[PDB]
Amino acid sequence: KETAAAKFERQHMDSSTSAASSSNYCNQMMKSRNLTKDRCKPVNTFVHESLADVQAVCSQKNVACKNGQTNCYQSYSTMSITDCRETGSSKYPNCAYKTTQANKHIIVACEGNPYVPVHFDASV
């Protein structure tokens, strides 16, 4: 039973890189973070910031989440991010991803004690 905070980390955190290396980045990371396991997960974003910097967003700009909830936070600066998105050629167990590297504000839902990100909402 993964806690929610640990699941955000496994799905969203990639501090070991500054940026998406290849067009191949997404097929690889989606696989190693176990997101192609039971299904191809259709969309996922990886954040190439340290964990501290990303936990800090939980004290930045308070915004409405897309589901209308109000525990969403928008980062003040831009962050290095990679968007991973299934192509049309995508067929489980043979998940295939388009890699888009970008530098965007991130919006996360935060909860808990410690108040930390548990949900990736959007980037802008």
UniProtKB/Swiss-Prot annotation:
Q: What domain of life does the native source organism fall in?
A: Eukaryota
**How would you summarize the oligomeric state and partners of this protein?**
Interacts with and forms tight 1:1 complexes with RNH1. Dimerization of two such complexes may occur. Interaction with RNH1 inhibits this protein. Monomer.
Expression sites (tissue/organ) = Pancreas.
- Quick check: keyword Lyase in the entry? yes
Q: Membrane-spanning regions, if any?
A: none
Tell me the lineage of the source organism.
Answer: Eukaryota, Metazoa, Chordata, Craniata, Vertebrata
Q: Which family does it belong to?
A: Belongs to the pancreatic ribonuclease family.
Quick one: which gene encodes this? RNASE1
Function of the protein: Endonuclease that catalyzes the cleavage of RNA on the 3' side of pyrimidine nucleotides. Acts on single-stranded and double-stranded RNA.
Q: Which residues pair up as cystines?
A: C26-C84, C40-C95, C58-C110, C65-C72
Q: What is this protein called?
A: Ribonuclease pancreatic
The entry annotates sugar attachment on K1, K7, N34, K37, K41
Q: Which organism is it from?
A: Bos taurus (Bovine)
Q: Which residues form the active site?
A: H12, H119
Q: What GO cellular component entries does it have?
A: extracellular region
Q: Name one GO molecular function term.
A: lyase activity
